[PDB]
From a paper:
We selected a single [name] variant (S2ca5b6) with high affinity (KD of 14.5 pM), representing ~1-million-fold affinity enhancement (S2cWT KD=16.7 µM), and a t1/2 of 9.6 hours, for further investigation. To understand the molecular details of interactions between the high affinity [name] (S2ca5b6) and [name]-endo, we solved the crystal structure of the S2ca5b6-[name] complex to 2.27 Å resolution. The asymmetric unit contained four molecules of the complex, all of them revealing a lipid density of a very similar size and extending out of the F’-portal, surrounded by the [name]β residues. In this structure, the [name] F67 adopts a single outward facing conformation, like the alternate conformation observed for the S2cWT-[name] complex. Also, the side chain conformation of Y48β, R31β and Q50β in S2ca5b6 were consistent with the S2cWT alternate conformation. Crucially, S2ca5b6 mutated residues S30β and M98β create additional space to accommodate lipid head groups and wrap around the lipid density. These results suggest that the S2ca5b6 [name] prefers larger lipid head groups compared to the S2cWT [name]. Y28α makes additional van der Waals contacts to [name] Glu61 and Glu62, L30α to Glu157 and M98β to Tyr152. Altogether, the mass spectrometry data suggest that the affinity maturation of the S2cWT [name] primarily enhanced interactions with [name] heavy chains rather than significantly altering the repertoire of recognised lipids.
Residue numbers in the entry:
A (entry chain D): 2 to 192
B (entry chain E): 1 to 245
C (entry chain A): 7 to 256, 261 to 279
D (entry chain B): 1 to 104
Write the structure that this text describes.
Amino acid sequence: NSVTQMEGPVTLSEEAFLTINCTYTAYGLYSLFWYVQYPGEGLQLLLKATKADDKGSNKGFEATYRKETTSFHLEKGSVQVSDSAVYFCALSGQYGWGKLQFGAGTQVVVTPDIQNPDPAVYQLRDSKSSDKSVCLFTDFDSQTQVSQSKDSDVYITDKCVLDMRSMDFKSNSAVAWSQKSDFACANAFQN
Amino acid sequence: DTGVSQNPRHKITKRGQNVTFRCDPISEHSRLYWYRQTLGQGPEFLTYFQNEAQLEKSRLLSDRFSAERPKGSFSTLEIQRTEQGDSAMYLCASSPRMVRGAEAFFGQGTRLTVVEDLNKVFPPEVAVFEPSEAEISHTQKATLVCLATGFYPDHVELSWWVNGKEVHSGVCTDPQPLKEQPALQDSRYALSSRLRVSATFWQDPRNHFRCQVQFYGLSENDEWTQDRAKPVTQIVSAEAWGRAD
Amino acid sequence: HVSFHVIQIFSFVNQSWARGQGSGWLDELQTHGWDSESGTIIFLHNWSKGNFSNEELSDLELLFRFYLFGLTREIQDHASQDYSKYPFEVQVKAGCELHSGKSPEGFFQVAFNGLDLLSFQNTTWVPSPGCGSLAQSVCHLLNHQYEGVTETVYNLIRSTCPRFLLGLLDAGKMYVHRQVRPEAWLSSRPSLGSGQLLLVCHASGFYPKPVWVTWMRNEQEQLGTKHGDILPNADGTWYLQVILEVASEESCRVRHSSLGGQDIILYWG
Amino acid sequence: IQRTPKIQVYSRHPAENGKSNFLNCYVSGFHPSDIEVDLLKNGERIEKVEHSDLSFSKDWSFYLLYYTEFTPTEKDEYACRVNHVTLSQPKIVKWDRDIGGGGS
Ligand SMILES: *[C@@H]1O[C@H](CO[C@@H]2O[C@@H](C)[C@@H](O)[C@@H](O)[C@@H]2O)[C@@H](O)[C@H](O)[C@H]1NC(C)=O
Ligand SMILES: CCCCCCCCCC
Ligand SMILES: CCCCCCCCCC
């Protein structure tokens, strides 16, 4: 493929500068594009540049068609959590009339800045069946690494960011669960 | 904003079977493309129609694959004798006539999962887990957890419904399902989600919370010989009311 | 041989039957064909690729396939609204021409039913004075609603064409700048009147095209001969005949770059 | 507009009885490009005829070379037969061993 883009994921906090590198091999009067795929959604155009030295701009993202360096780097000055997505560099050959040729995609994970961590582990019971239960690790800062499980009977998800918009509040959490009856939340998460 | 429409949205087929995907481009777009996408990779080109004419196919396109666009409008893509590796998202895109540097408008895709046996297809079980009193007293917030387990194949859409309406605030679902048994090719899958609301909101027993899992399964057309219910495409939900204690 | 010409000819006979063919040329010498079955470039010589990569040439090949189908369809769509105008034929000549120390020439010219219709000047589609309101309104469309096409044409004729042409000329120098010697011979037959004798000096199989064949009495040229056209052979060489009518009393010269300042003198009887 | 084809018939090499040669027919100056061209031996069509790809001159008029291997004898005759929308009947131009056909 003639479109090579940065291997991801790229992980950075809200307000940090984002750069996704993209290089290409092309001929004549090609056109360059950046597509974005938000979680659970289809692909859609983010920005485009049809002619050399054209800068494509959208919602703070920008990419400049730079012939002489064979580049279409995606930059955004100040990322927001909602920018977490997969970004695809793309090239229309046949002098800008051809099919999009895509890079492999670069996942961006934008982490919330938690200034007031209240890291804790809780146990929640099932609303139907009190005996089944789940563990919740939450309110930890974004630099905290959640250990993967070393037990096949114990499942631990990756971290996930929720945003309570009505209260300008973001928090990290991860979940763990098991069939074992002797299942202890304190153990699931390495303290 | 009627965009590109693809049907079906998802499709499970038994290896060896034929499938036909359909695409309706944006009204009057003369240019129509079919691409294939596997998670972790960009869309891969399959074929290009200018009006009704198929002016370019991928060199690596299999003879099993054939597309048509008989009236320069809707297009069909048929894969004969499916294989596991044909499993992917089949994307249709359309572009306007006579515009250079044109945007390609993508549909939502047909997600194709080729299975060895349809008998292993299973809808999720779904449970809602109630907020911890420790979380409430300690933070004045309340996290509900939804857990979808034992499903196969791995495609579900989990959404949260508070008081009859879907919500996106306070919600965070796992990026990907996880394998209940990672060493197995036919592992079933699980997925968790979290909805965080104020403690006082959860404490009100008049508030209704629902975790809804859309499962993509067998079609009405598929053969079924088990006593268990045909694992058709369906919704499975768990629900709870608030509680004062 | 300083100019690359890519030509198209589009024939519109019915609203159901239209047809597009094309070729590339160094003047009289064909360097490229187009297989319309497959929509591909035919590289007629093993230097026809010039200094371009397969990738650059594949990319151009698909552009031409789309253009040929697209131009044909766009015309068929506007014309099928008046079956009266059929049949008609559209021609295109596009390319470039190099001149040492100057900007290269770039052109894109279009004909309709054998007459100038419009051409591309700088960044503007200018109509032929001779094609009236038809030409005028087609140029309005291209200048106002096909700017994407205009930018493509500009770049092809002003950037790609010179680059390709230099590579093509470099790759085929030996064949294009080759010298091939004419065979020359005299022959006789009666005229249908006058002197009642036709002397015919022939030269065939020479290359390049510049040639000088003049009948001559002693060291003095003999005016009043019929000079033929320089006509092509299938090998790229040329043929020429020159006729002197005489009443039959009592030399034809042959000059060419391939003879290295040694002309061919045939005497006759 | 239309233009009538000009037809010139000539041999690749000096004709010599019983020596394989090539017979050329150059048809030029015509429009539109739709044309039928046969090479004839004693007024019968020769089956193995080849032609250059279509081209056109400064004035947009089309031109074409048809050619085929032949062997000139004392007695065999040879022609170029062209039909075109400008012509109401095929036009036949005999080859002459000494001056060709079609002049100019
Ligand atoms: C093709 O050549 C182009 C013209 O360059 C000149 O001619 C070639 C054949 C060489 O002799 C070179 O040294 C001369 O400068 C270049 O513009 C171009 O880079 C070359 N390559 C391609 C793929 O276009
Ligand atoms: C792909 C090239 C299309 C050019 C437009 C032709 C306009 C036809 C108007 C009669
Ligand atoms: C019927 C009029 C033909 C129009 C020819 C336009 C050709 C432009 C190609 C760029």
